[PDB]
Design a protein around this ligand. Sequence first.
Ligand SMILES: [Co+2]
Ligand SMILES: [Co+2]
Ligand SMILES: [Co+2]
Ligand SMILES: [Co+2]
Ligand SMILES: [Co+2]
Lengths: 364, 356
Amino acid sequence: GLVPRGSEIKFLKKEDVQNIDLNGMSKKERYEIWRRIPKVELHCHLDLTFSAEFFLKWARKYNLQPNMSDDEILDHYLFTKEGKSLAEFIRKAISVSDLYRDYDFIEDLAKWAVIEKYKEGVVLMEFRYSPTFVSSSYGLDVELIHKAFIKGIKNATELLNNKIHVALICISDTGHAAASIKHSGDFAIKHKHDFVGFDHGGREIDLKDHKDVYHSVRDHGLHLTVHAGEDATLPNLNTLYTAINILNVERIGHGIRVSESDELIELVKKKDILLEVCPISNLLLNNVKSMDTHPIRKLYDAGVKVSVNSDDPGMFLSNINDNYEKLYIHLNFTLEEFMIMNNWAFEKSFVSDDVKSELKALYF
Amino acid sequence: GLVPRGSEIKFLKKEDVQNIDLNGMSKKERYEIWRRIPKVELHCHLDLTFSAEFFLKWARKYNLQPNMSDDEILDHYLFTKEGKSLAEFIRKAISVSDLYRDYDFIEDLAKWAVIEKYKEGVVLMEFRYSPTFVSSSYGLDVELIHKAFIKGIKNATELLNNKIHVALICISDKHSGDFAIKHKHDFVGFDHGGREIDLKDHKDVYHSVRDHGLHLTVHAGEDATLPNLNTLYTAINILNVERIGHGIRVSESDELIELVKKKDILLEVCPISNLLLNNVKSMDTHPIRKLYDAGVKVSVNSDDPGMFLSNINDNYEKLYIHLNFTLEEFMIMNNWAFEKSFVSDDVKSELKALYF
Ligand SMILES: [Co+2]
Ligand SMILES: [Co+2]
Ligand SMILES: [Co+2]
Ligand SMILES: [Co+2]
Ligand SMILES: [Co+2]
């Protein structure tokens, strides 16, 4: 194991919380506090998780843009600036899938994604990836892609003395055909011993006809989440009703448009569903007007279970603690409230009771 | 110009094709018949129009895939195989947009696209391109994009001795409405592609562009996954377009069939496109037969020759094989396409003196 004994993060105890004075601190001092929260992260797409330095290493290795500067490369591929559309994010994400050229990239991606989460002070990390997104550009074999992610992750956890625990959620393909829908859980089910969860993302659409396949996947022991209530542009909140009542999910990725309906606020609380909130993602994809008006404040105060998440660190060049900082500055979130949401994330995690008992003894 | 007098295409005369027996022809022999139709092509995205050899030339020039064979490069980038998704098409079009790295590429693309249409026996070619799509990957200057497309077309028309007339349509972003308007001298029409949902909000820009004398077409009634046909009613009643790109879902409504007809609107049908993106279940079931038989004005188009490695005569061949199209019906559609072309009166007078 590579990290020296006394250099492991000094995670915050219930009993360190009140001694912390956040308002006395610099930005840098405050970031060390976000780091010391023993974080359970529920919503992060591993296939778009990277640092700037990882991305440039691979862009140079693949000789992608020999006449661009490092900054021009980041500008060219990524989505770090306010003012642009969801469409353009979609386009650059597809542009990024051009690096999925071989299994060495995939392994190294997983390895560094774990290392960076570990360094952020994440102790329990649910990563989700799409087998179809990863295989799409170079026609990589989904079995070998899955083995490469598991291998990258396992070898990083070995290096870190299991100081971080990692689990995997499978993102469904997006075929519209009845028979492709029927078979969209096949990969997740085949690999049920590696996945703890099943998800659906992409275009926010009518998922009523995913009823049967969501049920089939839960009948095989996998937990259910779904992206719904993200897309500001939709004319109604049907997708959210569908998530909760037809798909019967345990959690919703984003769910921020639940804030717009007292009925939905009440239903979520009733069904004890957690909302996997991705503040920076929401701002960058124009799903909120500003961070000042992000509805996580309203949802939290209304008694809805919500957690903090990063979504796509690579695309946004923003990892988990950056999301904490945003909530602090713009919405007056306190350490106390962060600790409360983290505990719900822990409770709503899809990992085994055994991984949970081990982490409860440590931090909760 | 470069082509000898006697090597120019001997085009079929409109009402003198009853002597031609297609059924006794080889495939190769039939292709020469399709070539000899003096074609008016209405719907083709210049920014996705290329041959395999053109693509390979630039693929190697730009060192895109040094460890791939030619066939692997074509499989990687292009969308020539049946039973793939519209999602994979979108993604491939984005991968092909990675070649828009400079203006030399765009010049050479537009030159060769014109030369190949001309070799196909296209006499009147309306090319459409999206300034936003072409500038999207490397942020090329849209003014310089437009200059490069105009110049490469002119590079080809100057070689070809007035044998092919080319015109441009602008495909939209309002900025692109503004762009179309600024370049109203170079564009004969305005279009909207991409996401078939609500063009109800494009109502005002469509009216604005119309005010500047650009003709109006729109992609609508293409997308099989749409839950209703409202995009068609919008295009017709709200945008008040002169023609509709694809429009094939017009076939699923007798009300739409009669409105299109009453409006004398033409449907720009793209057979191979529709099949490869699964907007029809098979060629042998493409709505163009029903539409044609219903009295609806329709024309034959290639859409995206480089994505599909299929140019205009390949589309004729499909229609002949699978949908019982005859040389007489091809001549009728072609004359409709001429009638519905957005080109000037001066250009039409010149072409009536030959073929129409
Ligand atoms: Co353990
Ligand atoms: Co997400
Ligand atoms: Co002339
Ligand atoms: Co639009
Ligand atoms: Co088109």
